[PDB]
Amino acid sequence: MKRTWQPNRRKRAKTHGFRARMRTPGGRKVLKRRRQKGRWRLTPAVR
Amino acid sequence: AVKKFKPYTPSRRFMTVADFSEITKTEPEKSLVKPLKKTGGRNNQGRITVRFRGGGHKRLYRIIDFKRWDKVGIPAKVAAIEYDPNRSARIALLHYVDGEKRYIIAPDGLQVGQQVVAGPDAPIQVGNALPLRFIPVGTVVHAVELEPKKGAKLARAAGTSAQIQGREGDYVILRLPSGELRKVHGECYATVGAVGNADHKNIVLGKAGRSRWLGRRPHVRGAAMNPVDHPHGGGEGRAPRGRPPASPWGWQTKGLKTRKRRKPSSRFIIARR
RNA sequence: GUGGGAGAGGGUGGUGGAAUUCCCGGAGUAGCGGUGAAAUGCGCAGAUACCGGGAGGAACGCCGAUGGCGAAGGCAGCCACCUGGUCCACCCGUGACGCUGAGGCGCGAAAGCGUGGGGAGCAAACCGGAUUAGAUACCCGGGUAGUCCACGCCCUAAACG
RNA sequence: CCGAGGGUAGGGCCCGUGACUGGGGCGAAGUCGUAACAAGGUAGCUGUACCGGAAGGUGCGGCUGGACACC
RNA sequence: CGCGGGGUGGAGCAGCCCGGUAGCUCGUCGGGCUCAUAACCCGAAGGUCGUCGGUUCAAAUCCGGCCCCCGCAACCA
RNA sequence: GCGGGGGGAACCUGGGGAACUGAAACAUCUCAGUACCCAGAGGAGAGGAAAGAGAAAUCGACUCCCUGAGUAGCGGCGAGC
RNA sequence: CGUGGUUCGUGGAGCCAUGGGGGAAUCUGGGCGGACCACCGCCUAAGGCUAAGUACUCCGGGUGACCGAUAGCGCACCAGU
RNA sequence: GGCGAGCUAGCCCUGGCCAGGGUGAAGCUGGGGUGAGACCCAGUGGAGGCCCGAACCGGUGGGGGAUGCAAACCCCUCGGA
RNA sequence: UGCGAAUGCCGGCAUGAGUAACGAUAAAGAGGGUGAGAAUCCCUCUCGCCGUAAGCCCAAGGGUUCCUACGCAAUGGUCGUCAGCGUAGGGUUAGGCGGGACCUAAGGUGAAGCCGAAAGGCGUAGCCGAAGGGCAGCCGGUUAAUAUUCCGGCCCUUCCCGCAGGUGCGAUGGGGGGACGCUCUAGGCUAGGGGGACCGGAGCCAUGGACGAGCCCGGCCAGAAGCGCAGGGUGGGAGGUAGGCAAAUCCGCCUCCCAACAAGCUCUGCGUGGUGGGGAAGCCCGUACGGGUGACAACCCCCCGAAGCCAGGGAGCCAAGAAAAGCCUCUAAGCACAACCUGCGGGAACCCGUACCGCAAACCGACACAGGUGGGCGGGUGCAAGAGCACUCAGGCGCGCGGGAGAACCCUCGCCAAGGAACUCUGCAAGUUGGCCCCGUAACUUCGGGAGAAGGGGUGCUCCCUGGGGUGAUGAGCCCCGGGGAGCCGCAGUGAACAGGCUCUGGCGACUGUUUACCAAAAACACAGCUCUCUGCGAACUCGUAAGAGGAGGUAUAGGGAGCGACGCUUGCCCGGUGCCGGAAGGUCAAGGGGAGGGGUGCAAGCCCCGAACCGAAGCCCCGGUGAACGGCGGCCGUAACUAUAACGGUCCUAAGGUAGCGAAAUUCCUUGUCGGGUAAGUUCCGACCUGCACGAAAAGCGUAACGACCGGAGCGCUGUCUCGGCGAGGGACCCGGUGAAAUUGAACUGGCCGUGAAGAUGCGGCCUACCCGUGGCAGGACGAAAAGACCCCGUGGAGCUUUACUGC
RNA sequence: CACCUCGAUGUCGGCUCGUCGCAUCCUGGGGCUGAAGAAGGUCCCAAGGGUUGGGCUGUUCGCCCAUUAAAGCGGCACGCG
Ligand SMILES: NC[C@@H]1O[C@H](O[C@H]2[C@@H](O)[C@H](O[C@@H]3[C@@H](O)[C@H](N)C[C@H](N)[C@H]3O[C@H]3O[C@H](CO)[C@@H](O)[C@H](O)[C@H]3N)O[C@@H]2CO)[C@H](N)[C@@H](O)[C@@H]1O
Ligand SMILES: [Mg+2]
Ligand SMILES: [Mg+2]
Ligand SMILES: [Mg+2]
Ligand SMILES: [Mg+2]
Ligand SMILES: [Mg+2]
Ligand SMILES: [Mg+2]
Ligand SMILES: [Mg+2]
Ligand SMILES: [Mg+2]
Ligand SMILES: [Mg+2]
Ligand SMILES: [Mg+2]
Ligand SMILES: [Mg+2]
Ligand SMILES: [Mg+2]
Ligand SMILES: [Mg+2]
Ligand SMILES: [Mg+2]
Ligand SMILES: [Mg+2]
Ligand SMILES: [Mg+2]
Ligand SMILES: [Mg+2]
Ligand SMILES: [Mg+2]
Ligand SMILES: [Mg+2]
Ligand SMILES: [Mg+2]
Ligand SMILES: [Mg+2]
Ligand SMILES: [Mg+2]
Ligand SMILES: [Mg+2]
Ligand SMILES: [Mg+2]
Ligand SMILES: [Mg+2]
Ligand SMILES: [Mg+2]
Ligand SMILES: [Mg+2]
Ligand SMILES: [Mg+2]
Ligand SMILES: [Mg+2]
Ligand SMILES: [Mg+2]
Ligand SMILES: [Mg+2]
Ligand SMILES: [Mg+2]
Ligand SMILES: [Mg+2]
Ligand SMILES: [Mg+2]
Ligand SMILES: [Mg+2]
Ligand SMILES: [Mg+2]
Ligand SMILES: [Mg+2]
Ligand SMILES: [Mg+2]
Ligand SMILES: [Mg+2]
Ligand SMILES: [Mg+2]
Ligand SMILES: [Mg+2]
Ligand SMILES: [Mg+2]
Ligand SMILES: [Mg+2]
Ligand SMILES: [Mg+2]
Ligand SMILES: [Mg+2]
Ligand SMILES: [Mg+2]
Ligand SMILES: [Mg+2]
Ligand SMILES: [Mg+2]
Ligand SMILES: [Mg+2]
Ligand SMILES: [Mg+2]
Ligand SMILES: [Mg+2]
Ligand SMILES: [Mg+2]
Ligand SMILES: [Mg+2]
Ligand SMILES: [Mg+2]
Ligand SMILES: [Mg+2]
Ligand SMILES: [Mg+2]
Ligand SMILES: [Mg+2]
Ligand SMILES: [Mg+2]
Ligand SMILES: [Mg+2]
Ligand SMILES: [Mg+2]
Ligand SMILES: [Mg+2]
Ligand SMILES: [Mg+2]
Ligand SMILES: [Mg+2]
Ligand SMILES: [Mg+2]
Ligand SMILES: [Mg+2]
Ligand SMILES: [Mg+2]
Ligand SMILES: [Mg+2]
Ligand SMILES: [Mg+2]
Ligand SMILES: [Mg+2]
Ligand SMILES: [Mg+2]
Ligand SMILES: [Mg+2]
Ligand SMILES: [Mg+2]
Ligand SMILES: [Mg+2]
Ligand SMILES: [Mg+2]
Ligand SMILES: [Mg+2]
Ligand SMILES: [Mg+2]
Ligand SMILES: [Mg+2]
Ligand SMILES: [Mg+2]
Ligand SMILES: [Mg+2]
Ligand SMILES: [Mg+2]
Ligand SMILES: [Mg+2]
Ligand SMILES: [Mg+2]
Ligand SMILES: [Mg+2]
Ligand SMILES: [Mg+2]
Ligand SMILES: [Mg+2]
Ligand SMILES: [Mg+2]
Ligand SMILES: [Mg+2]
Ligand SMILES: [Mg+2]
Ligand SMILES: [Mg+2]
Ligand SMILES: [Mg+2]
Ligand SMILES: [Mg+2]
Ligand SMILES: [Mg+2]
Ligand SMILES: [Mg+2]
Ligand SMILES: [Mg+2]
Ligand SMILES: [Mg+2]
Ligand SMILES: [Mg+2]
Ligand SMILES: [Mg+2]
Ligand SMILES: [Mg+2]
Ligand SMILES: [Mg+2]
Ligand SMILES: [Mg+2]
Ligand SMILES: [Mg+2]
Ligand SMILES: [Mg+2]
Ligand SMILES: [Mg+2]
Ligand SMILES: [Mg+2]
Ligand SMILES: [Mg+2]
Ligand SMILES: [Mg+2]
Ligand SMILES: [Mg+2]
Ligand SMILES: [Mg+2]
Ligand SMILES: [Mg+2]
Ligand SMILES: [Mg+2]
Ligand SMILES: [Mg+2]
Ligand SMILES: [Mg+2]
Ligand SMILES: [Mg+2]
Ligand SMILES: [Mg+2]
Ligand SMILES: [Mg+2]
Ligand SMILES: [Mg+2]
Ligand SMILES: [Mg+2]
Ligand SMILES: [Mg+2]
Ligand SMILES: [Mg+2]
Ligand SMILES: [Mg+2]
Ligand SMILES: [Mg+2]
Ligand SMILES: [Mg+2]
Ligand SMILES: [Mg+2]
Ligand SMILES: [Mg+2]
Ligand SMILES: [Mg+2]
Ligand SMILES: [Mg+2]
Ligand SMILES: [Mg+2]
Ligand SMILES: [Mg+2]
Ligand SMILES: [Mg+2]
Ligand SMILES: [Mg+2]
Ligand SMILES: [Mg+2]
Ligand SMILES: [Mg+2]
Ligand SMILES: [Mg+2]
Ligand SMILES: [Mg+2]
Ligand SMILES: [Mg+2]
Ligand SMILES: [Mg+2]
Ligand SMILES: [Mg+2]
Ligand SMILES: [Mg+2]
Ligand SMILES: [Mg+2]
Ligand SMILES: [Mg+2]
Ligand SMILES: [Mg+2]
Ligand SMILES: [Mg+2]
Ligand SMILES: [Mg+2]
Ligand SMILES: [Mg+2]
Ligand SMILES: [Mg+2]
Ligand SMILES: [Mg+2]
Ligand SMILES: [Mg+2]
Ligand SMILES: [Mg+2]
Ligand SMILES: [Mg+2]
């Protein structure tokens, strides 16, 4: 049956993208955290 | 008046469509005069602030002229009578002699050949527009300014009209379609006559769908909800209102008067009961 | 046919005043209403009675008759438009072209009915006061439908001379 | 082939009959009230409409087969 | 079994609750009015207060039991 | 023309600011001006030279440590602070 | 007047702060010493800056009656994988 | 305090899809009817949250599955279309 | 700092067990090859399975999986020599396809502005944003692998510079256009398909017959200008001009003049077109693959015919159907040497994508998972049609464990004597029926319906005659729709597959719709419709601290809230309480005004503190209204000339005491009420009565045609539901080879009875029975597994919900 | 009553399959009889076997139809998911 992951490469980048995160203080602090934790990738892949 | 239908289907039995014989145009409208428009009943923040709206037919917004007083004295020919789907009423296309084209809401009794003017000058005749101070007492009237130069807010709905009961100082006394009795400034324009397509009120939607076409989504009663949802909901096996009947938001929906008390507007209102 | 005539004859659009009710303002005080007599009701939160203003609906006083019109039901302030029947004088025209009329069709007071309006006064139902053994009545205070308009139905009658 | 008729299926009309139900006729002296006949004590009748144990009452319009004093 | 109210002239209700006193309407009786009956007027009669114990000076009235009456409740199962 | 912008583990000041919990229930009260969120600051930050203390004719800017002291008080005079 | 801060929870409630209303004076002026008044004292509001002593540990170093690969950081190993 | 409407619900903007058959509304034309009508019939016409039924959307009943092919499936049947 | 327990934590290893399974029942068999090794790789043949797909193409998404060489440890549910796996090399080519140096849509962002403790919220213009608008490439060949990309052929677009000819040029400004719905649909085309006795072609005569006007294969594709057919769009001239926020000659508007037509002008489609290019069976080798000839290939007639094209076509309807740029046109500055227009010519023409999978073993589902996933094309025959159904093209596949046996049992399926619902909560299930044509068709009805009512007849093949249609000629041929006659065979002609069982009668809901993703599809929601109510417009109301917004670019025939729920006939009485609505008086009423009087302290002038009367809102009280507002609509006793019963009376209470209708009900306890119907027999059902525990009128009352995967009752038809089972098929189950789990598990050397024991003993007592160990089976027991019982209580545990609980906001 | 079981002892009825008790429904054997015969009554022995089909209701039960030699009552976690 239909399931919850329906990949659409645009949606990934406009939702979880780097410019998303920067646009908003919630999201800048996600980057702050991801970075300070030493995350290799601050933000999701999409091609 | 009001086409009916044989019952070749359930709901074709009660359906009732307008007599469009008045309409001289069909698929127009004057392309120079109309933008578009959209909504959802949702508001700038994304939220439903009016319940049960959506879907229904695409529309182009006929731009229509509620200021007659900026053409004072130029005459106009009624060019067509056509179908506005943003209003109960009908809109007449009129060519001015400027060559300027404009929409007006179309009075009852307005044939399309005729001449129409607006201003203190102004014969008193169906279609003309004047300061209320120059319209003879007892005239029925529609498309009335509430305040001078601000546009017509009063009696624009298909079939509506209003009436001059007398004059006081700078103000004349009107009986609105509501029956309210009201003073409006002398300087407010109004056009003479009644709105027409008065047969409007007798259409019979006939099926759920005819409501959907108009953007009217199903309306679910408090009674049919749970108590999270609404002052009446629960018990079930039906239930009487169990309390003074209420809105979703808790206020009382029988008898309770919501007009604000100190509105400086009350100096100009005498009625409505 | 011509020339005339009387008329609330019918349909339409207008419109006038008297009155009732309601509201506003004045002035003004203790009752007003109602009946057989009373009570309910209304009234110092200022009624009734008086004056001024406005709103609105409905019916048309004197004329008015023991009268006129219409086939009947029916028709009554005034103005206009449109329109029917009818009478008299002339003796002009056609030349029996007539009378009736099962069925058909149409009209049909009041009440009632549908859909919109309108709603002053009145008033089924209903409520109250009184009366009475009782009083689901007659009288009194209220009062909705209705009474009015448009459209469409109903098709009855002591529709009687 | 037609064909008495048998069979299956669905109509129409007519008689009979049926818990129960509706009124109606009729049957000396049961119960309630008084509508009508005299202005019958609210003149009556009436089409219709609502109401009411019952007769009836009320509304609207109509019929007369109803009307020597008082303002 | 349970909880609340009740049991008063012939009928329907007051009075109990706050101790001492039994009242209202209808009925029934006697008399009028009427030819007569009702309507109506004037008059009277009528109850031990379910019952059994107690309290008190005194109990329809306060308490207990019994006998009935009306009502409410009996749920998770 | 000079400057600002953004980042920094924790630490600092400011603007805002909880609930569980405790009170053996719970509202005042507590947790707590904590957690958190926001702005700014720096290598520190804040504070700082008396319209101060507060009983002495005394002390002499501010910060931090010990002490005063679980004292003075505060407190559904409760838990507690 | 309405609140916050203080130990102060409306208390006899001052002090400091201030959202609202009213609204002065310049030494013979003003604040304060716990309502208020008198006396006696203290102090000079409504401009600003100010090292050091203090906080902290991303970082570097020294030292452990600190661990020794189920411990010690989550990660002794190309782990915030 | 933040992260989520790539599932799902609603709306918004812009596209797309709906074999085939059936039944036969108004209207229009003609004819009849009438004083003129209403109206009647025929042809035409092609309306409809109209009918049968694929695609598509469903999920009615029953069987199966039940450490499944599957954390909702399969088969027969069935609703809309 | 000592472990045995915490359904503890981490790891390791056991049991179950060589057990269940090995993932669609579309199906395999042999021969040859390869190799250490082969059911499983390669090739051949035969068989079988998809074919509106299980074929082909595109978009997502995925991200080297593509091609080839070498490999088989692992991955692959077995095997593997094989692979989507390991290693390694190679492979994606564009001015025209897609997207960007274009346009705008929702939305987003956002100079200006506005608002907000901070962070931030909003917002005009603008900007961003696409599967929409605009926009120039068609056919073939080529590689192991890419191709509208490379190559061949034939076309085209922009920009730059030049030349010529033309012209008031000139834009971000004005105007036109772009530019639009849904049904139905004309005429002409093409895609595609069928047939030909005609054209071209290797070859074949088998097994009885056939040397044939035989049989089998094929008989096209792309193509500028010009042209032809079919269509789209489309007036011309002047005069006036005040409108289109300047300007206009443009557009608008008025007047006059000629066109009425595509006449012309113009655009597109098709066709034809120089030219370019393909081109079968078969046979031969020779292939993962395809390669020669056949060939110098032929290359044409007929017919069927789109849903596609001409395209802004036409008609009708109402619910009334984007924008902006390209494009044209108008003028402003400004420049008129410039600029623009047209044609020609040369030059210039960037970035990204391009492999491969793509209904799936490569995407979403932890899996090579029976699930899910948008657009396109999807051939042939026959059955009325069709994308349906059976077979079949091209093309693709036999589903990555196999071999045997032929028990129980299970699943899926076939058939059955007599009976025919006796089954059972219920005909659940299965069966019947079944398409098309024709006859025929009731109650009732809102006059449409009900209807496919019901019930029947027809249904193949042959020969004969015969009517109209399309296309062609008015002809034949080819197709289409018929009509009549006479015969043939079988058990049977919708001969297989796809395709209603029907009738009667109740309850509920008007109807189509909607719903609990994943135990409820319904009598629930919604629904047209009716009523109340609010709301005069900066509306009421909703979201937001606000700004702002929705409402609505709406205006009382509108908009919000509430209830009721098509339609019919109707919806009674009570306003005491509560709510709402109205009331300028009165009462009480907080801050504030007031300051009679009192107080503290000063020598005092004073400073400070109380503070009565009185004035002082809303609210409350009070007065009234109000029912499609919350709601509520009685008790006891008596009475008729049998009896019963009580039209009638008495009395007590209420704000008023339930009208009509309906009633043992989706409501009736007693209850299986009583009576009637149906049945041989009826706690259900249907019709009645009325003693309504405990109906009743918009939480509507009573009805109602039509409708329903709703729930009840009855009949006919028909049946393996049943009497009552039998047989048969296949996939399991069994046996063999390969692979090999699971929950559970204190340890076990794990019998029966009668007792006993914490009360239900394999484990204790007595007695009985009993050689050791397994296989296939059944489920009585291990108080069997699973899930720290959901019911029940407990806890001063939690959460959702309500209110005239408290206290706040 | 509250003793095992609330870290689970699935609850009515049906069906299937039984097995046991006897306080015997039938058949066998008997005593008494107010037993003429036949046919009953009541009691004693006896558990070997037997003990129907159907309408209604979820029903157990029960009512009813048609038969019967008879249409037995109980236990087995109201035997047996
Ligand atoms: N035709 C009958 C009609 O209906 C009614 O008639 C019936 C009754 O009204 C009337 O009943 C009457 C009654 O009014 C009168 N006041 C009392 C009287 N005893 C009764 O009488 C009846 O009862 C007795 C039985 O006891 C019978 O024997 C007698 O025949 C009969 N009259 O008797 C009639 C039946 O017999 C009306 N009276 C009237 O409309 C008309 O007469
Ligand atoms: Mg789907
Ligand atoms: Mg790195
Ligand atoms: Mg937003
Ligand atoms: Mg739609
Ligand atoms: Mg609703
Ligand atoms: Mg609900
Ligand atoms: Mg919610
Ligand atoms: Mg609520
Ligand atoms: Mg409720
Ligand atoms: Mg209920
Ligand atoms: Mg006249
Ligand atoms: Mg006349
Ligand atoms: Mg003559
Ligand atoms: Mg009439
Ligand atoms: Mg009338
Ligand atoms: Mg009156
Ligand atoms: Mg008369
Ligand atoms: Mg015959
Ligand atoms: Mg016959
Ligand atoms: Mg009388
Ligand atoms: Mg009378
Ligand atoms: Mg009389
Ligand atoms: Mg009356
Ligand atoms: Mg006494
Ligand atoms: Mg910084
Ligand atoms: Mg702070
Ligand atoms: Mg606590
Ligand atoms: Mg608690
Ligand atoms: Mg410093
Ligand atoms: Mg500093
Ligand atoms: Mg400083
Ligand atoms: Mg503290
Ligand atoms: Mg404080
Ligand atoms: Mg203080
Ligand atoms: Mg001073
Ligand atoms: Mg101070
Ligand atoms: Mg001090
Ligand atoms: Mg002091
Ligand atoms: Mg000091
Ligand atoms: Mg050590
Ligand atoms: Mg060591
Ligand atoms: Mg470690
Ligand atoms: Mg080690
Ligand atoms: Mg670790
Ligand atoms: Mg979504
Ligand atoms: Mg969505
Ligand atoms: Mg398709
Ligand atoms: Mg179709
Ligand atoms: Mg059709
Ligand atoms: Mg159709
Ligand atoms: Mg349909
Ligand atoms: Mg299903
Ligand atoms: Mg379901
Ligand atoms: Mg269908
Ligand atoms: Mg120790
Ligand atoms: Mg231990
Ligand atoms: Mg085993
Ligand atoms: Mg096995
Ligand atoms: Mg397999
Ligand atoms: Mg298999
Ligand atoms: Mg096949
Ligand atoms: Mg096919
Ligand atoms: Mg991709
Ligand atoms: Mg490969
Ligand atoms: Mg392997
Ligand atoms: Mg590889
Ligand atoms: Mg761009
Ligand atoms: Mg460039
Ligand atoms: Mg743009
Ligand atoms: Mg924004
Ligand atoms: Mg695009
Ligand atoms: Mg595009
Ligand atoms: Mg392009
Ligand atoms: Mg090609
Ligand atoms: Mg490519
Ligand atoms: Mg120009
Ligand atoms: Mg433009
Ligand atoms: Mg041969
Ligand atoms: Mg062959
Ligand atoms: Mg061919
Ligand atoms: Mg060509
Ligand atoms: Mg050759
Ligand atoms: Mg068109
Ligand atoms: Mg699929
Ligand atoms: Mg596909
Ligand atoms: Mg694949
Ligand atoms: Mg597989
Ligand atoms: Mg799959
Ligand atoms: Mg699909
Ligand atoms: Mg077919
Ligand atoms: Mg198929
Ligand atoms: Mg059989
Ligand atoms: Mg049979
Ligand atoms: Mg069935
Ligand atoms: Mg069939
Ligand atoms: Mg049939
Ligand atoms: Mg044959
Ligand atoms: Mg069918
Ligand atoms: Mg029933
Ligand atoms: Mg329904
Ligand atoms: Mg449907
Ligand atoms: Mg629902
Ligand atoms: Mg569900
Ligand atoms: Mg359904
Ligand atoms: Mg607005
Ligand atoms: Mg708007
Ligand atoms: Mg409802
Ligand atoms: Mg209803
Ligand atoms: Mg009512
Ligand atoms: Mg009331
Ligand atoms: Mg009242
Ligand atoms: Mg009230
Ligand atoms: Mg007052
Ligand atoms: Mg007040
Ligand atoms: Mg009152
Ligand atoms: Mg009543
Ligand atoms: Mg009953
Ligand atoms: Mg019954
Ligand atoms: Mg009941
Ligand atoms: Mg019944
Ligand atoms: Mg009810
Ligand atoms: Mg009601
Ligand atoms: Mg009913
Ligand atoms: Mg019905
Ligand atoms: Mg349905
Ligand atoms: Mg259904
Ligand atoms: Mg069987
Ligand atoms: Mg077998
Ligand atoms: Mg042993
Ligand atoms: Mg034992
Ligand atoms: Mg022992
Ligand atoms: Mg075994
Ligand atoms: Mg077992
Ligand atoms: Mg088993
Ligand atoms: Mg537990
Ligand atoms: Mg407690
Ligand atoms: Mg609690
Ligand atoms: Mg116990
Ligand atoms: Mg005990
Ligand atoms: Mg338990
Ligand atoms: Mg256990
Ligand atoms: Mg267990
Ligand atoms: Mg015995
Ligand atoms: Mg014997
Ligand atoms: Mg025995
Ligand atoms: Mg049953
Ligand atoms: Mg029973
Ligand atoms: Mg049991
Ligand atoms: Mg079970």
Numbering used by the authors:
A (entry chain P8): 1 to 47
B (entry chain 11): 2 to 274
The authors write:
In this work as in our previous studies, we employed the full Thermus thermophilus 70S ribosome co-crystallized with long synthetic mRNAs and natural tRNAs. We determined six X-ray structures of the 70S ribosome programmed by 30-nucleotide-long mRNAs with AUG codon and E. coli tRNAfMet in the P-site and the A-site occupied by tRNALysSUU bound to its cognate codon AAA or AAG, or near-cognate stop codon UAA and isoleucine codon AUA. To discriminate against pyrimidine-ending codons AAC and AAU encoding asparagine, the E. coli tRNALysUUU contains one of the most complex modifications 5-methylaminomethyl-2-thiouridine (S, mnm5s2U) at the wobble anticodon position 34. Another prominent feature of E. coli tRNALysSUU is N6-threonylcarbamoyladenosine (t6A) at the 37th position of its anticodon loop.
Thus, we determined structures of complexes 3 and 4 where the SUU anticodon of tRNALysSUU formed a U·U mismatch either with the first or the second codon position. Two additional structures of the near-cognate complexes 3 and 4 solved in the presence of antibiotic paromomycin, which stimulates miscoding, supported our previous conclusion of the antibiotic mechanism of action. In both cases, paromomycin stabilized A1492 and A1493 in the ‘out' from the interior of helix 44 positions, hence stimulating A-minor groove interactions with the first two nucleotides of the A-codon. In addition, binding of the antibiotic led to a positional shift of the A1493 phosphate, resulting in partial alleviation of the restrictive decoding centre from the side of the mRNA codon. Finally, in the ribosome structures with paromomycin we observed a displacement of helix 69 of the large subunit towards the D-stem of tRNALysSUU that, most probably, enhanced stabilization of a near-cognate substrate on the ribosome.
